[PDB]
Structure 1
Amino acid sequence: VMGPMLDAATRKPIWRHEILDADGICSPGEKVENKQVLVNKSMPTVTQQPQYKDVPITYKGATDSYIEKVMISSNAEDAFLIKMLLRQ
């Protein structure tokens, strides 16, 4: 998960990465609009330096939603599962 891409012009995150926290994960308590990313995920393309391409989880919705909780768990496969609870 990549951090929020801060805009060098205003030194603040862009409108798309505005709801993301320092760790790139959207924090509860804020409102989510249409076409906004929740997890700035980036995965490698090889499977010499790894080449990561971004595949963020965008929110498709006509109306706004509020993040209530963001649970983060780790499975036996070292896989991180992140669940965001949107409320309307």
Structure 2
Amino acid sequence: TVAVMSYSGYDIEDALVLNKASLDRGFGRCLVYKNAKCTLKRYTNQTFDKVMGPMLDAATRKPIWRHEILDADGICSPGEKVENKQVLVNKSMPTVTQQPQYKDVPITYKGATDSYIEKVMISSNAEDAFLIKMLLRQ
């Protein structure tokens, strides 16, 4: 519902004044969906990327804050809210360049604002690679 008039002087050059009550009721309400994907591969040597479980705090029987939203498989769980510098997939990879020794390579949510996880997709390719895709919502 547009009134074509000059109101408040905050509309001098193409700027348009909106109504607060209309925005509260749902005018212009939008959703932004973003991706995050991780690939776990099987190398030429018989070694593999892996997802470690959440690293618990031994003193409090709860995961550390950077791991707060990880499920027991080390992949983030649908419904929970991610915040900046929090891990989504607790990936570790071999530094082969006698037993394996692993360096942590976590997929982490960089983003100035908080996002919610809607679904986590797990599928595999013929080469025994494991593919994980996260759908994120704001």
Please tell me the TM-score bracket, short chain as reference. over 0.9
SS of 2:110's equivalent in the other structure is coil
SS of 2:135's equivalent in the other structure is strand
Match of 1:56 among 78, 97, 106: 106
Tell me the TM-score normalized by structure 2. 0.63
Q: Percent identity?
A: 100
Structure 2 gap segments, 5+ residues each:
1-50
- Distance, in Å, in 1 between the alignment partners of 2:112 and 2:75 is 22
Cα displacement string for residues 57-82 of structure 1 (whole angstroms, at most 9, x for unaligned residues): 01110000000000000001100000
Cα displacement string for residues 24-72 of structure 1 (whole angstroms, at most 9, x for unaligned residues): 0000000000000000000000140101110000111000000000000
- Distance, in Å, in 1 between the alignment partners of 2:103 and 2:64 is 19
Cα displacement string for residues 2-27 of structure 1 (whole angstroms, at most 9, x for unaligned residues): 00000001010010001000010000
- Distance, in Å, in 2 between the alignment partners of 1:47 and 1:74 is 25
Structure 1 gap segments, 5+ residues each:
none
SS of 1:37's equivalent in the other structure is strand
User: Aligned ranges for residues 61-76 of structure 1 at < 5 Å?
Assistant: 61-76=111-126
- Distance, in Å, in 2 between the alignment partners of 1:80 and 1:14 is 26
SS of 1:78's equivalent in the other structure is coil
Runs of 4+ in 1 over 6 A off after TM superposition: none
- Distance, in Å, in 1 between the alignment partners of 2:78 and 2:71 is 10
Q: What is the aligned residue count? A: 88
- Distance, in Å, in 1 between the alignment partners of 2:107 and 2:73 is 15
